[PDB]
Every structure is written in structure tokens, then in C-alpha cells.
Design a protein around this ligand. Structure first.
Ligand SMILES: C[As](C)(=O)[O-]
Ligand SMILES: C[As](C)(=O)[O-]
Ligand SMILES: [Zn+2]
Ligand SMILES: [Zn+2]
Ligand SMILES: [Zn+2]
Ligand SMILES: [Zn+2]
Lengths: 315, 316
């Protein structure tokens, strides 16, 4: 109940501390980092940049990140373990599928996909023994037949293991409502689910209604506006004011290299947000305190809500 | 110069022997074999099946295969090296891209794709030091804009290294004609190019015209008609011989020992339809052609001489 899986092994949830629940070391494609590391300068250069960035985040307060990179985002859990250790920042790895499944994933059934997700949660990723601590799913605004299979497999895996589900969403298409209906149709409890990229919208009724059902709300792309970001942050305040503090999760959706986008967008992002993953502790947290948000409510959001979210719970 | 790179290192062209120029150990997707080996039972079970299948081909006279699995077909050159050593069959590895490129590939420029294909030929694949000895390219319909980028990057990598290009085509759409036009626009000699999956048509004049331009003609899915008869497809070999284009013919099975990039259990369907596997060409097509009057010097030219000329890196 009280044990989380990280790339360095099992920890107790009290050690997780302050947690960023939607991040990436590298946004890529399956096999790509190993086949073409010099797209990132080199693998060594990429690991060093992530270590520097994670160390700055740790200085600013962060203890744990959740790397929500799936198989098809090029998750390299060996890289995650190397940089977690050098930075001394906990990293939770993910299973699931994002928006770029290859044929060998697109053609699988819900049962087969369920077995794959259970493999990565219960046995380990590839040949590393590193077990995922969260399931990441991505859908387009209107859920495709394959993405619905992914959703159902995520729910079945989450129910067999208690590990949570976190989603990629088109918030401006109310993407979370269709995901929730599918997930609930599988008997998945909403307190096991986080509707992500939920800060890309003004629709507070959309945001407030999912929280009331028990969903976690991911305001995980605040710094991306800064390429205003306080309008996005003010959604955290708006939700606290409606009484849904136990339902907010905040993050940067940052990364230190990206190949699944046009070339050189990493440098435009870094010179737009020099703070990287430190943006949440350094710029958002004090902005919220300076609107009268109690220090204690923030610790609940940045520490307590992620701990409740990640604890394997058959409930 | 007269050396061909394999997954065990360089070999001289005389070492290649009887060569199957379009084959696969495993038809999969990037990262998939290592993330989900149990899809194939296990990595060990897949390797053992491939060793038996390659040993069966070897006993039917095969000495080399060209594994034309790209990055996005889940090529695992460590697996190819293991099974090559256990079976004593040379395996040439491929660079290039097939029809399932992930986003990190689809968003690259022709200049970036060129660098990737060059790295796999000149430096090595992943961190294994195994260098590709062929560039595989697939297109559909009229070539998509991205596929044209791959075609041009392949031409540029070939022109820099002398390594040949081999293609996946839809022959029923005469897909080789657009491939040839794009490659020739880059300055690539047709003698460096094998237009593959060419047996899946009856349009002999389409094939003859490409051969007349100096393209190699890949007649590589004959066993797939065995579940048109495979003998009908095999007569395209004799037809090209009779027009005097024996030099342009490459024959293969397009077989594999595991496949994840299709519906589950298709491998059982393929194996029961073609129990010969990669031995289909030597055990069935070669005898059939002999019985139709093709002499041994011609069959040895097709299966030994043609692949050696094709694979030997050449800037001429
Ligand atoms: C890898 As993303 C930009 O969908 O969080
Ligand atoms: C079966 As194929 C298109 O990989 O030659
Ligand atoms: Zn996302
Ligand atoms: Zn993300
Ligand atoms: Zn093909
Ligand atoms: Zn093939």
C-alpha cells in the first residue's frame, strides 16, 4: 500500500516528498535514443544536461518526478536510472501508450495490451527489472478505436495492481470527459486517474466537474505559455476556491531533449523557460502564496496529493 | 573495396556464396523485441527458431542472407549477430526506413535522414559496431512526400558509401517507376538499386523496362503465393532470363521467423503455408527452373554472381 516503484527501486511514500507528476527526461520514439544518440549531441551530453537540470530542480525544492514517457515516447529507463542517481532525485517510470504506437502495438488486442502494461508494472521494463509506477495514456480529442483499447487496458492493469493512470488530453476539446466514461465503464475508480494537460483551457466547469467525480486534475503545462503563465496558474487558485484542493496536480511537462518534434525546438523552449523543471517550485509556488494561498495548502498539492495518487490502492 | 559488411564483420565477396537478398529474422517495430520478448514466446525461443531455420537454408546451399529489416521494422542487430554465429550463415544488416517510421523519424529533413543512414553504414548500428551493408526503402502509391525524402537520403548515403539501395514496392501500381525517377534525379546509378516485391505482378513489360534501364529486379515473395500459384510467379524469372536480363535478377523468399507487425498468430499461418521457410527458393524454385530448362551456370549467376555484384560497395 505504502510502497512506490522508482527507477532506483521501491521507496516508501514518505520519501517521495515534493513530486512533479508529469515530466520527461527525453521526449523521443521507441529505439531512437539508442539508434541515433548524436541527434542529442551524444547520449553523454543528454544525460549531463538532465543531471544539471534535475540538480537545479532539487536545489529549488523538488524531490521526485514522474517521467510519463511511454514505450512510444522513447522511454529509456536505463537513462532514467542513470540521471536519477546522479541528481539524487526520485524518478517514477511509466508504462502505457502515447500517440505514436508502432504497428506492433497498433495491431494488438485489449487483452494483449493489458499483458504488456502488467509486464512493465509487475515484472519490469525491458531486461532492467525497473517496474513502472504509473500508466500513461494519450487520446486525441475524440477517442479513436485503438486509443479506447489502450484506455481499457490501462484500467484493467490499474485495477490488477493499484497503480494509477495519467492521461494526455486536448483540454480545449474537453478530452477528459470521453476518457473518464471509458475508464469508468471498466470499473476503474476516478481517484486512480489523473486527467492531464488540463491547464490548456478556461472552461472551469469542465475542470470543476471532473474533480467533483474524484478525478485528479493536471495543470502540468504552466511554463509552456511562457514561449500568460499566471492565467494558467490562476486555475490552481480557482480550483482551491471551489473546494477541490485534494484534486490538483501541478507540473512543468518539461524535458531535456526532444526528437519527436521539429529540430531545435529544445533550444526555443530552454531560452523561453530557463528554469526548466524548477519553474513550478520557483515561479508558480510563490505566485500562489502571494495570492493568499496558505503554505499548507501548497504542500498538500505538491506533496500530499501526489503521494495519495501514486500509492498502489485496490480502491 | 571488395568487402561486404556483415553482422560478424567484413567478408570478401567470394565468401558470400549463395545469397538470399531480401529476408528477415524478425518483422517487428523499433524497441519492441526488447520491450516485449514474450510476444514471441521469448527472445531465446525466437533466436533458436531462427538458428534452425537458417541451418535448414544453409543445408539447402544458402551461405548469406540480407536482412532488410530497418530501424522501424524493429531490427535487432545483436540478435542477428547471435543467430548468424550459431548458424554459420552470413547476415548483412540494413539501414533505411520502411513503412512504419515513428515521429522522431517522420519529422526529420532529408539532410538529417542522410546523416542517420550514413551513421549506420559508416560507424555502426546503435553501440554494436555492426555496419549496415544495404539501404532499404519502402514507398506506397505515388511516393508520399516523406517517402521521397527517404528515397533521396538513401541515394545520398549510397553515393557516399557505394552500398546499394533495395526497395519495397507495390508492383500492381508499378511503384518502381516513381522510385526510379526520384533516385535517378539524385544521380544514383540504376545498377545500385533493386526494385523489390516485383514478382507480385503479371506486367512483364513493366519489369523488362526497368531491367533494361539497369535496375536489379527483386523477385522476392514467390513463397507468399504458396499461402496465383508460386510457379506462375517463378516463371517471371525464366521470362527475364529469356529476354537476356539474367544479370538483373535477384530472388529471395521475404521470410522471417517471428512477426509482430501484423495480426497475432500470422506466423503460424505462414509457416503452415510455407513449411520450407527460407529454403523455399533453393528447394522449390531452383528445381522448378531447372526442369524448365534453365542451366546451372544461369542459376548460379542469379543466386551467387548477381548478389555479389549488387552488394559489393561500388562507386562506379
Ligand atoms: C510528450 As507531450 C508534449 O504530449 O506531454
Ligand atoms: C512483409 As515486408 C512489407 O516487411 O517485406
Ligand atoms: Zn502530453
Ligand atoms: Zn508530457
Ligand atoms: Zn517489403
Ligand atoms: Zn521484406
Amino acid at each position: 500500500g505504502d510502497r512506490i516503484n522508482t527507477v532506483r527501486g521501491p521507496i516508501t511514500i514518505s520519501e517521495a516528498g515534493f513530486t512533479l507528476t508529469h515530466e520527461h527526461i527525453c521526449g523521443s520514439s521507441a529505439g531512437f535514443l539508442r539508434a541515433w544518440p548524436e541527434f542529442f549531441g551524444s547520449r553523454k551530453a543528454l544525460a549531463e544536461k538532465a543531471v544539471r537540470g534535475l540538480r537545479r530542480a532539487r536545489a529549488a525544492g523538488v524531490r521526485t518526478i514522474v517521467d510519463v514517457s511511454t514505450f512510444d515516447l522513447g522511454r529509456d529507463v536505463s537513462l532514467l536510472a542513470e540521471v536519477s542517481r546522479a541528481a539524487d532525485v526520485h524518478i517514477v517510470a511509466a508504462t502505457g501508450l502515447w500517440l505514436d504506437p508502432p504497428l506492433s502495438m497498433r495491431l494488438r488486442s485489449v487483452e494483449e495490451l493489458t499483458q504488456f502494461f502488467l509486464r512493465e508494472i509487475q515484472y519490469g521494463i525491458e531486461d532492467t527489472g525497473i517496474r513502472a509506477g504509473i500508466i500513461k495514456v494519450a487520446t486525441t480529442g475524440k477517442v479513436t478505436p485503438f486509443q479506447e483499447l489502450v484506455l481499457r487496458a490501462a484500467a484493467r492493469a490499474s485495477l490488477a495492481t493499484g497503480v494509477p493512470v495519467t492521461t494526455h488530453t486536448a483540454a480545449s476539446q474537453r478530452g477528459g470527459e470521453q476518457q473518464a466514461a471509458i475508464l469508468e465503464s471498466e470499473g476503474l475508480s476516478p481517484s486512480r486517474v489523473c486527467i492531464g494537460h488540463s491547464d490548456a483551457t478556461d472552461d472551469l466547469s469542465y475542470l470543476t466537474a471532473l474533480a467533483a467525480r474524484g478525478y485528479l486534475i493536471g495543470l502540468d503545462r504552466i511554463p509552456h505559455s511562457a514561449i500568460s503563465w499566471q492565467t494558467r496558474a490562476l486555475l490552481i487558485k480557482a480550483l482551491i476556491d471551489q473546494g477541490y484542493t485534494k484534486q490538483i496536480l501541478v507540473s512543468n511537462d518539461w524535458l531535456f531533449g526532444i526528437s519527436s518534434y521539429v529540430t531545435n525546438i529544445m533550444d526555443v523552449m530552454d531560452s523561453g523557460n530557463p528554469d526548466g523543471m524548477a519553474f513550478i517550485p520557483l515561479r508558480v509556488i510563490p505566485f500562489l502564496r502571494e495570492k493568499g494561498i496558505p503554505q499548507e495548502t501548497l504542500a498538500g498539492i505538491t506533496v500530499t496529493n501526489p503521494a495519495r495518487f501514486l500509492s498502489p490502492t485496490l480502491r
